[PDB]
Amino acid sequence: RFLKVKNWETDVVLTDTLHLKSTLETGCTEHICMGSIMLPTKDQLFPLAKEFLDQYYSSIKRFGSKAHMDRLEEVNKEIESTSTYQLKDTELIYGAKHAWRNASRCVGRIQWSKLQVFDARDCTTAHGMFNYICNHVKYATNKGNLRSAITIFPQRTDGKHDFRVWNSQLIRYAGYKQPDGSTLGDPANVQFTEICIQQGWKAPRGRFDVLPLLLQANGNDPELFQIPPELVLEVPIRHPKFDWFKDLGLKWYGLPAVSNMLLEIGGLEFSACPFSGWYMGTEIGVRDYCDNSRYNILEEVAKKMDLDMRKTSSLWKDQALVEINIAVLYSFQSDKVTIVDHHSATESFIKHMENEYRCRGGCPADWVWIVPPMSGSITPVFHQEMLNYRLTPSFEYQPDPWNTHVW
Amino acid sequence: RFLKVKNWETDVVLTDTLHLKSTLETGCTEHICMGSIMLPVRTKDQLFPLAKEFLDQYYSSIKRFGSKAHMDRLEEVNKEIESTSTYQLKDTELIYGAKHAWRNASRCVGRIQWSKLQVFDARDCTTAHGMFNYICNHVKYATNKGNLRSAITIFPQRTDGKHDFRVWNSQLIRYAGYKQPDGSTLGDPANVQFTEICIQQGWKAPRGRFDVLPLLLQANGNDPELFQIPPELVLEVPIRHPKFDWFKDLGLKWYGLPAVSNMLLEIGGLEFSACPFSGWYMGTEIGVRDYCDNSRYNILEEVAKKMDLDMRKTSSLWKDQALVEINIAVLYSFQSDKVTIVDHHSATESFIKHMENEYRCRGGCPADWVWIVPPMSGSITPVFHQEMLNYRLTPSFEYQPDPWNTHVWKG
Ligand code: HEM
Ligand code: HEM
Ligand SMILES: COCCN(C)c1cncc(CCc2cc(C)cc(N)n2)c1
Ligand SMILES: COCCN(C)c1cncc(CCc2cc(C)cc(N)n2)c1
Ligand SMILES: C[C@H](O)[C@H](O)[C@H]1CNc2nc(N)[nH]c(=O)c2N1
Ligand SMILES: C[C@H](O)[C@H](O)[C@H]1CNc2nc(N)[nH]c(=O)c2N1
Ligand SMILES: [Zn+2]
C-alpha cells in the first residue's frame, strides 16, 4: 500500500504515499497494462467541491478552521440553490497551478508554482475571447523571454453553453492536401484547416501559414479571428555549421500553447483554458520535423549531408536527427527565445520529483511521455522508475468540438 | 471482450483477444500504473490445473485437441502428479514450452525469430561439471563462428526448492568489474558484486578492463563451482569506427554472444531455474547501454573530446552526437567481422511486422512499450508510435532472486 520507486542509475529509492489519494482511473487492470495507450449533478458535485476545499484549506495551514467550515458551508448552500458554485480567485489560482502540478505527462513541472493565471470568467463573446488570448500571447511571449500562463474562460453550465477554443494550440501551421496527393504544410492540421476554410477562412496555401483562431463562446457558433502577426514570435531555423540548412526554409513558432484540454477544479469544468510555457527542443526537432506523419524532413537533410542512405545500419537517420535538433536549439538561443534542451529539462524533472516526494509524498509521472523521443537512456529519467496515477485538479482530454457541435 | 491498439503514425488499428488468456497479474490496478517498474515448492493442488492448461495449449497447437492422445496424456500427468507430486515433460512439450516462453516475452523486441530456437535438453545433468560441459556446447553451437544461432539449454526442474540448479552468472559471457580503493572502477561496473563473489570463490582475477568472468555453476542445490569458459569459444569484436581512426585506440571490444542465464523458465507449472538462452545483439544494447550508461563503461566524454565537440553546454548535444558515432562503430565492427548483429531500425521494423502477424494469427502480442522502444532515437523507430498492451501469458520467462541471497551454504 506504500509504494517504492527506484532509480537504477543512482540506487536512490523513494516511497510514494500520494497515490492513495488518487480517485480517477488509469485504464490498467490487474491483468493488463495500458501504459502505452494515448487515450484510455448536485450529488456528484459536493464531495468533489469538499475534496478540493479540504486540500485548499490544508495547503494554507488552515484545515479545520471556521473559515474552512464557513466556505464548505457556503459552497454547500450554493450547490443546493444554484446546482453549481463559483470559485474564489484564490481557489481558481490554486486549482490551475495544481492541475499543472498533477499533469503526469509533463516533464516541465518544476516550474508549476510559477504560473500566471488570467481570470477570463467574465468573458461573453468570441471577440472577448480573442482579446483575452492576444493578451495571453503577448504576456507569455514577453519578447522571447517566455513566461508560463493560463487564461481561464467561463466554466461549463449545462454543456449547452460551452466555451471552446477549436484550435489544438493557439499557434499552429496549416496543412493542405494537394492534387499531387502530397501534403502541404503540417499534416496534423489538415482537417482543422478545412474546418476553417469551410467556415470562411481565406487560406494563403503556404507551408507555414499561422492558423486563425476559431473561437466558441457560450455554446454559440464558433467565429474566426487572426492573431496579430506582430504577436506571433517565430524562429528561422539555421545550423551553426551547415550553411545550407537555412535553404530548407524551415521555421517554427516560439510559444507552445495548448488550447484543446479541459481543466477540472473542485468538480467544475473549464472547457476553454489555453495554457503555455516554453519548448523543449526535441518537441520541434524530433517530433514536429522528423515524425513521418509530420514535416518529415529526415531524407532531405540526410541528402544535404551526403550520408550513405543505402542501409539503415549507417545510422544516417540518427545522425541527421541530432543535427536537426542542434539547429533548433541553436536558432532559438540565437534569437533569444526561451528553450530548454532535453538534458537540462529531464535533469530538472528528477530534482522536482525528489522535491515532490520529499514535500508531498510523491509525484505522478508517465514514463512513456516523460522520456524524450531521442537519446532516452542518456537522460536521467530513463533510469527512473515512475508511478502513474490521476489526481485532481487536472487537465483532461475532451472531444474535438466539431464532432459534438449542434450548429 | 475486445481491445484495440492504434499506431499513431499509420492509423492502423489492431484488435486483441489474446489478453483473455492472461492468467498472471501485471502489478497495475484501476488506480495506478506500474508500467515503468523494473520488477513488480508448489502443491499438487495448484499444479494439475497448470499442467492441464499447458497440455490443452500444446495439443491445440498440434491440432489434436480432445484426441485420445490428448486425453491419455492428461491422465498420465494427473497420475504422475498425484503419486510423485510433480511430472516430467515430453521432449516435444519441452521444446514447445521454451519456444512459447520466448514468444510470450513482452519485453523482447526480437520475437519475430521465436519459432527458430535450438532447444538443448540438459535434464539428465547431475553435477556442476556436467553443467559446464553443456554450457560450453551451447556457446559453441550458438556462436557458430559468428553466424549466430538462437539457443536455450534446459537443466533439471525444481523439485523441493532445496536442490535447485542455478547459473550464478547473470549472463554466460560478461566482463569483470573491480572496485578500486580510490573509489574508481576498473572493467564493467555492473559486475562488481559478482566479480567479488568469483574472487572469493577462488578465481584468480587478471584485473583488466575486459576480463571474461568464470562460470559459477550450482547443481542439485549444492555449493556452486568455478569454471573458465575456454577462451577459444569466446568470440569477441574489437570496436573501431569507419571514418574515425582514433576510435580503435580507445581500446574497446565486446563479446558477440548475449546469453541470459539468471531467469526462470515456467512451463505447465514446472520451474526451470537454470535455463540459459542466447540470441544475437541489437547494436544499442552495447553502444548505448553497455558503453554509455553513466553506471557502465561510461565513455561518452572521452569520445566527445576526441571528436572535439563543444562540451561546455548540454545544448550543443555533444552527448547525443558522440552516442550516434559509438553506435555506428559497434554496428560497423560486428558487420566487418561477420558477427551477427541487428540495428535498432531493422529490429523495430521487423517487430512491428511480427506484432501485426501475431494479432492476425494469434489474436494478440503482449508487448512492454517501455522496454521495446530503443534507448536512443526512440521516435524515429516505428515502435514509438505503436500502442501496445502488456499482459502475462504462460509458458514464460520470470525473474528470480539472485542465488547468493538465498543459497544455503553446505561448506
Ligand atoms: C514551462 C515550460 C514547460 C515545458 C518545458 C513543458 C514540457 C512538456 C513536454 C515536453 C510535454 C510532452 C508534450 C508532447 O510530447 O506532446 C508536456 C506535456 C504536457 N504539459 Fe508541459 N511543459 C511546460 C509547461 C507547461 C504548463 C505551463 C502547463 C499547464 C499550465 C503544462 C501542462 C502539460 C500537460 C497537461 C501535458 C500533457 C498534454 C497531453 O497529455 O497531451 N506544461 N510538457
Ligand atoms: C535472436 C535475437 C534477439 C534479439 C535481437 C533480442 C533482443 C532483445 C533486447 C534488445 C532485449 C532488451 C534487453 C535489455 O535491454 O536489457 C531483450 C529482452 C529479452 N529477451 Fe530477447 N532478443 C533475442 C533473442 C532472444 C531469445 C532467443 C530469447 C529466449 C529464448 C529471448 C528472450 C528475452 C527475454 C525473456 C527478455 C527480457 C529480459 C529482461 O526482462 O531482463 N530473446 N531481447
Ligand atoms: C494539443 O493538445 C493535445 C496535447 N498534445 C498531444 C500536444 C500535441 N502537440 C503539442 C503539444 C504541446 C505540449 C506542450 C505544452 C506546453 C504548455 C509546453 C510545452 N513545451 N509543450 C501537445
Ligand atoms: C541478464 O539478466 C537479464 C537482465 N537484463 C535486463 C539484461 C541485462 N543485460 C543484458 C541483457 C541481454 C538481453 C538480451 C538477451 C538475448 C537472448 C538477446 C539479446 N539481444 N539481448 C539483459
Ligand atoms: C525505470 C525503467 O523501467 C528502466 O530504466 C528500464 C526502462 N526501459 C528499459 N528498456 C530496456 N530494453 N532495457 C532496460 O534495461 C530498460 N530499463
Ligand atoms: C503509442 C505511444 O503511446 C505514443 O507514440 C506516445 C509515446 N510517447 C509520447 N511522448 C510524448 N512526450 N509525446 C507523445 O506524443 C508521445 N506519443
Ligand atoms: Zn499499467
PDB file of N, CA and C in Angstrom, chain A residues 9 25-26 28-34 36-38 286-287 291-293 311-315 318-319 323 326 333 341-343 367 373 375-377 383 385-386 388-389, chain B residues 3 9 22 25-26 28-33 36 38 288-289 293-295 314-315 317 320-321 324-325 328 331 335 343-345 369 375 377-379 385 387-388 390-391:
ATOM      1  N   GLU A   9      20.114   4.015 -11.901  1.00  0.00           N
ATOM      2  CA  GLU A   9      21.420   4.594 -12.164  1.00  0.00           C
ATOM      3  C   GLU A   9      22.058   5.049 -10.848  1.00  0.00           C
ATOM      4  N   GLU A  25      -9.395   6.858 -12.788  1.00  0.00           N
ATOM      5  CA  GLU A  25      -8.925   5.528 -13.158  1.00  0.00           C
ATOM      6  C   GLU A  25      -7.946   5.523 -14.338  1.00  0.00           C
ATOM      7  N   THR A  26      -7.073   4.513 -14.380  1.00  0.00           N
ATOM      8  CA  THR A  26      -5.920   4.509 -15.288  1.00  0.00           C
ATOM      9  C   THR A  26      -6.169   3.846 -16.642  1.00  0.00           C
ATOM     10  N   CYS A  28      -5.637   0.757 -16.769  1.00  0.00           N
ATOM     11  CA  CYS A  28      -4.956  -0.501 -16.445  1.00  0.00           C
ATOM     12  C   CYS A  28      -5.808  -1.383 -15.540  1.00  0.00           C
ATOM     13  N   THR A  29      -5.565  -2.685 -15.603  1.00  0.00           N
ATOM     14  CA  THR A  29      -6.132  -3.604 -14.628  1.00  0.00           C
ATOM     15  C   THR A  29      -5.049  -4.524 -14.086  1.00  0.00           C
ATOM     16  N   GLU A  30      -5.480  -5.445 -13.232  1.00  0.00           N
ATOM     17  CA  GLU A  30      -4.632  -6.478 -12.659  1.00  0.00           C
ATOM     18  C   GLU A  30      -4.081  -7.405 -13.743  1.00  0.00           C
ATOM     19  N   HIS A  31      -4.807  -7.505 -14.852  1.00  0.00           N
ATOM     20  CA  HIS A  31      -4.448  -8.437 -15.911  1.00  0.00           C
ATOM     21  C   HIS A  31      -3.840  -7.772 -17.140  1.00  0.00           C
ATOM     22  N   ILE A  32      -3.953  -6.454 -17.239  1.00  0.00           N
ATOM     23  CA  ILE A  32      -3.450  -5.777 -18.430  1.00  0.00           C
ATOM     24  C   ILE A  32      -3.019  -4.329 -18.179  1.00  0.00           C
ATOM     25  N   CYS A  33      -1.835  -3.974 -18.680  1.00  0.00           N
ATOM     26  CA  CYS A  33      -1.328  -2.618 -18.550  1.00  0.00           C
ATOM     27  C   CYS A  33      -1.528  -1.878 -19.862  1.00  0.00           C
ATOM     28  N   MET A  34      -2.183  -0.722 -19.775  1.00  0.00           N
ATOM     29  CA  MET A  34      -2.429   0.121 -20.939  1.00  0.00           C
ATOM     30  C   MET A  34      -1.589   1.375 -20.863  1.00  0.00           C
ATOM     31  N   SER A  36       0.803   2.363 -22.512  1.00  0.00           N
ATOM     32  CA  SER A  36       1.225   2.973 -23.778  1.00  0.00           C
ATOM     33  C   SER A  36       0.063   3.409 -24.673  1.00  0.00           C
ATOM     34  N   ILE A  37      -1.164   3.322 -24.161  1.00  0.00           N
ATOM     35  CA  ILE A  37      -2.323   3.807 -24.907  1.00  0.00           C
ATOM     36  C   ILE A  37      -2.404   5.326 -24.728  1.00  0.00           C
ATOM     37  N   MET A  38      -2.568   6.068 -25.825  1.00  0.00           N
ATOM     38  CA  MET A  38      -2.620   7.536 -25.744  1.00  0.00           C
ATOM     39  C   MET A  38      -3.884   8.068 -25.049  1.00  0.00           C
ATOM     40  N   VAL A 286      12.582  16.733 -33.143  1.00  0.00           N
ATOM     41  CA  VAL A 286      12.377  15.291 -33.268  1.00  0.00           C
ATOM     42  C   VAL A 286      10.969  15.014 -33.777  1.00  0.00           C
ATOM     43  N   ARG A 287       9.972  15.488 -33.034  1.00  0.00           N
ATOM     44  CA  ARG A 287       8.577  15.220 -33.381  1.00  0.00           C
ATOM     45  C   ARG A 287       8.061  16.083 -34.554  1.00  0.00           C
ATOM     46  N   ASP A 291       9.016  13.325 -37.393  1.00  0.00           N
ATOM     47  CA  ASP A 291       7.903  12.377 -37.442  1.00  0.00           C
ATOM     48  C   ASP A 291       7.489  12.156 -38.897  1.00  0.00           C
ATOM     49  N   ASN A 292       7.295  10.896 -39.265  1.00  0.00           N
ATOM     50  CA  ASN A 292       6.922  10.592 -40.639  1.00  0.00           C
ATOM     51  C   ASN A 292       5.571  11.189 -41.043  1.00  0.00           C
ATOM     52  N   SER A 293       4.672  11.351 -40.073  1.00  0.00           N
ATOM     53  CA  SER A 293       3.350  11.908 -40.354  1.00  0.00           C
ATOM     54  C   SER A 293       3.288  13.415 -40.086  1.00  0.00           C
ATOM     55  N   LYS A 311      21.830   1.726 -46.413  1.00  0.00           N
ATOM     56  CA  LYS A 311      21.491   0.787 -45.340  1.00  0.00           C
ATOM     57  C   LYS A 311      21.132   1.526 -44.053  1.00  0.00           C
ATOM     58  N   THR A 312      20.145   1.014 -43.322  1.00  0.00           N
ATOM     59  CA  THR A 312      19.744   1.626 -42.051  1.00  0.00           C
ATOM     60  C   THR A 312      20.907   1.629 -41.056  1.00  0.00           C
ATOM     61  N   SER A 313      21.766   0.613 -41.168  1.00  0.00           N
ATOM     62  CA  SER A 313      22.887   0.418 -40.252  1.00  0.00           C
ATOM     63  C   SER A 313      23.969   1.507 -40.262  1.00  0.00           C
ATOM     64  N   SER A 314      23.946   2.416 -41.239  1.00  0.00           N
ATOM     65  CA  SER A 314      24.862   3.552 -41.217  1.00  0.00           C
ATOM     66  C   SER A 314      24.409   4.576 -40.171  1.00  0.00           C
ATOM     67  N   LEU A 315      23.211   4.365 -39.629  1.00  0.00           N
ATOM     68  CA  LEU A 315      22.572   5.305 -38.702  1.00  0.00           C
ATOM     69  C   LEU A 315      22.482   6.736 -39.273  1.00  0.00           C
ATOM     70  N   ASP A 318      19.750   8.659 -37.592  1.00  0.00           N
ATOM     71  CA  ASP A 318      20.157   9.119 -36.268  1.00  0.00           C
ATOM     72  C   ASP A 318      21.085  10.330 -36.353  1.00  0.00           C
ATOM     73  N   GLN A 319      22.000  10.316 -37.319  1.00  0.00           N
ATOM     74  CA  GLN A 319      22.925  11.437 -37.494  1.00  0.00           C
ATOM     75  C   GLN A 319      22.190  12.707 -37.873  1.00  0.00           C
ATOM     76  N   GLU A 323      21.651  16.513 -35.726  1.00  0.00           N
ATOM     77  CA  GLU A 323      21.907  17.810 -36.356  1.00  0.00           C
ATOM     78  C   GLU A 323      20.687  18.725 -36.408  1.00  0.00           C
ATOM     79  N   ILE A 326      20.242  19.993 -33.077  1.00  0.00           N
ATOM     80  CA  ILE A 326      21.243  21.024 -32.851  1.00  0.00           C
ATOM     81  C   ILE A 326      20.776  22.369 -33.427  1.00  0.00           C
ATOM     82  N   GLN A 333      18.131  29.873 -29.267  1.00  0.00           N
ATOM     83  CA  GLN A 333      19.105  30.551 -28.413  1.00  0.00           C
ATOM     84  C   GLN A 333      19.622  31.824 -29.090  1.00  0.00           C
ATOM     85  N   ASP A 341      16.930  22.328 -23.550  1.00  0.00           N
ATOM     86  CA  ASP A 341      17.301  21.037 -24.161  1.00  0.00           C
ATOM     87  C   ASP A 341      16.810  19.874 -23.294  1.00  0.00           C
ATOM     88  N   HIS A 342      16.753  18.667 -23.863  1.00  0.00           N
ATOM     89  CA  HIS A 342      16.198  17.524 -23.144  1.00  0.00           C
ATOM     90  C   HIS A 342      17.059  17.084 -21.965  1.00  0.00           C
ATOM     91  N   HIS A 343      18.353  17.380 -22.014  1.00  0.00           N
ATOM     92  CA  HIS A 343      19.218  17.031 -20.894  1.00  0.00           C
ATOM     93  C   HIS A 343      18.895  17.907 -19.683  1.00  0.00           C
ATOM     94  N   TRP A 367       6.062   7.577 -17.574  1.00  0.00           N
ATOM     95  CA  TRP A 367       7.409   7.386 -18.122  1.00  0.00           C
ATOM     96  C   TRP A 367       7.412   7.452 -19.657  1.00  0.00           C
ATOM     97  N   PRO A 373      11.984  11.821 -26.921  1.00  0.00           N
ATOM     98  CA  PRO A 373      11.879  10.977 -28.119  1.00  0.00           C
ATOM     99  C   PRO A 373      13.211  10.697 -28.813  1.00  0.00           C
ATOM    100  N   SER A 375      17.656   9.858 -27.685  1.00  0.00           N
ATOM    101  CA  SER A 375      18.705   9.716 -26.675  1.00  0.00           C
ATOM    102  C   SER A 375      18.165   9.354 -25.283  1.00  0.00           C
ATOM    103  N   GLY A 376      17.094   8.561 -25.240  1.00  0.00           N
ATOM    104  CA  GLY A 376      16.376   8.282 -23.999  1.00  0.00           C
ATOM    105  C   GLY A 376      17.244   7.891 -22.810  1.00  0.00           C
ATOM    106  N   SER A 377      18.126   6.922 -23.001  1.00  0.00           N
ATOM    107  CA  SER A 377      18.843   6.352 -21.862  1.00  0.00           C
ATOM    108  C   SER A 377      20.047   7.189 -21.419  1.00  0.00           C
ATOM    109  N   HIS A 383      16.181   6.018 -16.409  1.00  0.00           N
ATOM    110  CA  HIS A 383      16.548   5.057 -15.376  1.00  0.00           C
ATOM    111  C   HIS A 383      15.685   5.197 -14.122  1.00  0.00           C
ATOM    112  N   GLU A 385      12.327   4.821 -12.139  1.00  0.00           N
ATOM    113  CA  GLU A 385      11.003   4.204 -12.047  1.00  0.00           C
ATOM    114  C   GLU A 385      10.008   5.303 -11.711  1.00  0.00           C
ATOM    115  N   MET A 386       8.819   5.221 -12.298  1.00  0.00           N
ATOM    116  CA  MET A 386       7.770   6.206 -12.034  1.00  0.00           C
ATOM    117  C   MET A 386       6.426   5.523 -11.812  1.00  0.00           C
ATOM    118  N   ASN A 388       2.365   6.069 -12.206  1.00  0.00           N
ATOM    119  CA  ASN A 388       1.384   6.918 -12.865  1.00  0.00           C
ATOM    120  C   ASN A 388      -0.004   6.738 -12.250  1.00  0.00           C
ATOM    121  N   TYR A 389      -0.622   7.859 -11.888  1.00  0.00           N
ATOM    122  CA  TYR A 389      -1.958   7.866 -11.298  1.00  0.00           C
ATOM    123  C   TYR A 389      -2.557   9.262 -11.469  1.00  0.00           C
TER     124      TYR A 389
ATOM    125  N   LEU B   3     -10.075  -5.539 -27.277  1.00  0.00           N
ATOM    126  CA  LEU B   3      -9.265  -4.350 -27.008  1.00  0.00           C
ATOM    127  C   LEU B   3      -8.524  -3.883 -28.257  1.00  0.00           C
ATOM    128  N   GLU B   9       1.155   6.656 -36.279  1.00  0.00           N
ATOM    129  CA  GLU B   9       1.902   7.054 -37.467  1.00  0.00           C
ATOM    130  C   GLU B   9       1.160   6.592 -38.723  1.00  0.00           C
ATOM    131  N   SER B  22      -4.765 -14.333 -20.504  1.00  0.00           N
ATOM    132  CA  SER B  22      -3.808 -13.886 -19.496  1.00  0.00           C
ATOM    133  C   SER B  22      -4.236 -14.347 -18.101  1.00  0.00           C
ATOM    134  N   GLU B  25      -0.691 -11.694 -12.966  1.00  0.00           N
ATOM    135  CA  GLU B  25      -1.035 -10.274 -12.808  1.00  0.00           C
ATOM    136  C   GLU B  25       0.092  -9.295 -13.171  1.00  0.00           C
ATOM    137  N   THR B  26      -0.285  -8.048 -13.452  1.00  0.00           N
ATOM    138  CA  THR B  26       0.630  -7.050 -14.011  1.00  0.00           C
ATOM    139  C   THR B  26       1.348  -6.197 -12.968  1.00  0.00           C
ATOM    140  N   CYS B  28      -0.229  -3.506 -12.062  1.00  0.00           N
ATOM    141  CA  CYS B  28      -1.101  -2.338 -12.216  1.00  0.00           C
ATOM    142  C   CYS B  28      -2.468  -2.575 -11.599  1.00  0.00           C
ATOM    143  N   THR B  29      -3.163  -1.484 -11.293  1.00  0.00           N
ATOM    144  CA  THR B  29      -4.562  -1.540 -10.888  1.00  0.00           C
ATOM    145  C   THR B  29      -5.346  -0.446 -11.607  1.00  0.00           C
ATOM    146  N   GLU B  30      -6.642  -0.393 -11.330  1.00  0.00           N
ATOM    147  CA  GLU B  30      -7.511   0.638 -11.877  1.00  0.00           C
ATOM    148  C   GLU B  30      -7.086   2.022 -11.382  1.00  0.00           C
ATOM    149  N   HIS B  31      -6.227   2.051 -10.365  1.00  0.00           N
ATOM    150  CA  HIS B  31      -5.850   3.303  -9.702  1.00  0.00           C
ATOM    151  C   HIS B  31      -4.382   3.681  -9.875  1.00  0.00           C
ATOM    152  N   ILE B  32      -3.577   2.731 -10.320  1.00  0.00           N
ATOM    153  CA  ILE B  32      -2.174   3.033 -10.535  1.00  0.00           C
ATOM    154  C   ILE B  32      -1.578   2.199 -11.657  1.00  0.00           C
ATOM    155  N   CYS B  33      -0.699   2.820 -12.440  1.00  0.00           N
ATOM    156  CA  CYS B  33       0.027   2.079 -13.453  1.00  0.00           C
ATOM    157  C   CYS B  33       1.471   1.909 -13.012  1.00  0.00           C
ATOM    158  N   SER B  36       6.373   1.281 -15.564  1.00  0.00           N
ATOM    159  CA  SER B  36       7.808   1.612 -15.619  1.00  0.00           C
ATOM    160  C   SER B  36       8.635   0.987 -14.488  1.00  0.00           C
ATOM    161  N   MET B  38      10.712  -1.854 -12.845  1.00  0.00           N
ATOM    162  CA  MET B  38      11.515  -2.935 -13.433  1.00  0.00           C
ATOM    163  C   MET B  38      11.099  -4.334 -12.946  1.00  0.00           C
ATOM    164  N   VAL B 288      24.711   1.938 -26.799  1.00  0.00           N
ATOM    165  CA  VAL B 288      24.013   2.863 -25.918  1.00  0.00           C
ATOM    166  C   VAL B 288      24.158   2.515 -24.427  1.00  0.00           C
ATOM    167  N   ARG B 289      23.703   1.326 -24.051  1.00  0.00           N
ATOM    168  CA  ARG B 289      23.642   0.941 -22.639  1.00  0.00           C
ATOM    169  C   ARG B 289      25.009   0.532 -22.075  1.00  0.00           C
ATOM    170  N   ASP B 293      25.867   4.181 -20.618  1.00  0.00           N
ATOM    171  CA  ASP B 293      25.241   4.389 -19.311  1.00  0.00           C
ATOM    172  C   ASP B 293      26.294   4.984 -18.374  1.00  0.00           C
ATOM    173  N   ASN B 294      25.898   5.967 -17.571  1.00  0.00           N
ATOM    174  CA  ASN B 294      26.809   6.521 -16.568  1.00  0.00           C
ATOM    175  C   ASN B 294      27.305   5.433 -15.601  1.00  0.00           C
ATOM    176  N   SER B 295      26.447   4.449 -15.354  1.00  0.00           N
ATOM    177  CA  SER B 295      26.756   3.390 -14.395  1.00  0.00           C
ATOM    178  C   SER B 295      27.467   2.193 -15.038  1.00  0.00           C
ATOM    179  N   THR B 314      25.272  21.426 -22.492  1.00  0.00           N
ATOM    180  CA  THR B 314      24.487  20.284 -22.963  1.00  0.00           C
ATOM    181  C   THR B 314      23.748  20.587 -24.276  1.00  0.00           C
ATOM    182  N   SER B 315      23.390  21.858 -24.463  1.00  0.00           N
ATOM    183  CA  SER B 315      22.616  22.297 -25.619  1.00  0.00           C
ATOM    184  C   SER B 315      23.345  22.128 -26.958  1.00  0.00           C
ATOM    185  N   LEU B 317      24.419  19.394 -27.698  1.00  0.00           N
ATOM    186  CA  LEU B 317      24.055  17.985 -27.925  1.00  0.00           C
ATOM    187  C   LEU B 317      25.279  17.107 -28.207  1.00  0.00           C
ATOM    188  N   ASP B 320      24.593  13.436 -27.420  1.00  0.00           N
ATOM    189  CA  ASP B 320      23.808  12.815 -28.473  1.00  0.00           C
ATOM    190  C   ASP B 320      24.689  12.517 -29.674  1.00  0.00           C
ATOM    191  N   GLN B 321      25.550  13.472 -30.021  1.00  0.00           N
ATOM    192  CA  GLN B 321      26.429  13.313 -31.176  1.00  0.00           C
ATOM    193  C   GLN B 321      27.443  12.180 -30.995  1.00  0.00           C
ATOM    194  N   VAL B 324      25.735   8.626 -31.181  1.00  0.00           N
ATOM    195  CA  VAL B 324      25.492   8.081 -32.512  1.00  0.00           C
ATOM    196  C   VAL B 324      26.780   7.461 -33.097  1.00  0.00           C
ATOM    197  N   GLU B 325      27.884   8.192 -32.999  1.00  0.00           N
ATOM    198  CA  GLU B 325      29.149   7.709 -33.561  1.00  0.00           C
ATOM    199  C   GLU B 325      29.607   6.396 -32.943  1.00  0.00           C
ATOM    200  N   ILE B 328      27.403   3.681 -34.409  1.00  0.00           N
ATOM    201  CA  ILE B 328      27.874   3.400 -35.764  1.00  0.00           C
ATOM    202  C   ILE B 328      29.069   2.456 -35.692  1.00  0.00           C
ATOM    203  N   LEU B 331      28.066  -1.263 -34.807  1.00  0.00           N
ATOM    204  CA  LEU B 331      27.494  -1.916 -35.982  1.00  0.00           C
ATOM    205  C   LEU B 331      28.568  -2.216 -37.035  1.00  0.00           C
ATOM    206  N   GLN B 335      29.701  -6.060 -38.238  1.00  0.00           N
ATOM    207  CA  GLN B 335      29.499  -6.365 -39.649  1.00  0.00           C
ATOM    208  C   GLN B 335      30.812  -6.680 -40.353  1.00  0.00           C
ATOM    209  N   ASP B 343      20.591  -3.629 -36.321  1.00  0.00           N
ATOM    210  CA  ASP B 343      20.457  -2.243 -35.875  1.00  0.00           C
ATOM    211  C   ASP B 343      19.044  -2.017 -35.351  1.00  0.00           C
ATOM    212  N   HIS B 344      18.849  -0.948 -34.587  1.00  0.00           N
ATOM    213  CA  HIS B 344      17.554  -0.697 -33.964  1.00  0.00           C
ATOM    214  C   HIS B 344      16.437  -0.349 -34.953  1.00  0.00           C
ATOM    215  N   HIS B 345      16.797   0.149 -36.132  1.00  0.00           N
ATOM    216  CA  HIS B 345      15.810   0.379 -37.191  1.00  0.00           C
ATOM    217  C   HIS B 345      15.254  -0.930 -37.783  1.00  0.00           C
ATOM    218  N   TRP B 369       5.967  -1.523 -23.894  1.00  0.00           N
ATOM    219  CA  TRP B 369       6.471  -0.388 -24.677  1.00  0.00           C
ATOM    220  C   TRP B 369       7.761   0.172 -24.057  1.00  0.00           C
ATOM    221  N   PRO B 375      16.828   2.627 -26.703  1.00  0.00           N
ATOM    222  CA  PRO B 375      17.303   3.649 -25.753  1.00  0.00           C
ATOM    223  C   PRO B 375      17.955   4.859 -26.412  1.00  0.00           C
ATOM    224  N   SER B 377      17.145   7.455 -30.142  1.00  0.00           N
ATOM    225  CA  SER B 377      16.356   7.708 -31.346  1.00  0.00           C
ATOM    226  C   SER B 377      14.956   7.110 -31.316  1.00  0.00           C
ATOM    227  N   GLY B 378      14.325   7.080 -30.140  1.00  0.00           N
ATOM    228  CA  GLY B 378      13.057   6.388 -29.970  1.00  0.00           C
ATOM    229  C   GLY B 378      12.011   6.666 -31.045  1.00  0.00           C
ATOM    230  N   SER B 379      11.655   7.929 -31.251  1.00  0.00           N
ATOM    231  CA  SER B 379      10.507   8.202 -32.125  1.00  0.00           C
ATOM    232  C   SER B 379      10.798   8.129 -33.633  1.00  0.00           C
ATOM    233  N   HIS B 385       5.547   4.843 -31.982  1.00  0.00           N
ATOM    234  CA  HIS B 385       4.203   5.299 -32.346  1.00  0.00           C
ATOM    235  C   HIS B 385       3.135   4.214 -32.237  1.00  0.00           C
ATOM    236  N   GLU B 387       0.795   1.797 -30.136  1.00  0.00           N
ATOM    237  CA  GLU B 387       0.210   1.449 -28.840  1.00  0.00           C
ATOM    238  C   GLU B 387       0.390  -0.047 -28.613  1.00  0.00           C
ATOM    239  N   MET B 388       0.624  -0.434 -27.368  1.00  0.00           N
ATOM    240  CA  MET B 388       0.877  -1.839 -27.047  1.00  0.00           C
ATOM    241  C   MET B 388       0.075  -2.198 -25.818  1.00  0.00           C
ATOM    242  N   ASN B 390       0.266  -4.718 -22.497  1.00  0.00           N
ATOM    243  CA  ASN B 390       1.149  -5.619 -21.772  1.00  0.00           C
ATOM    244  C   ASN B 390       0.355  -6.534 -20.844  1.00  0.00           C
ATOM    245  N   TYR B 391       0.577  -7.837 -20.989  1.00  0.00           N
ATOM    246  CA  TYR B 391      -0.055  -8.816 -20.123  1.00  0.00           C
ATOM    247  C   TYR B 391       0.801 -10.074 -20.072  1.00  0.00           C
TER     248      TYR B 391
END
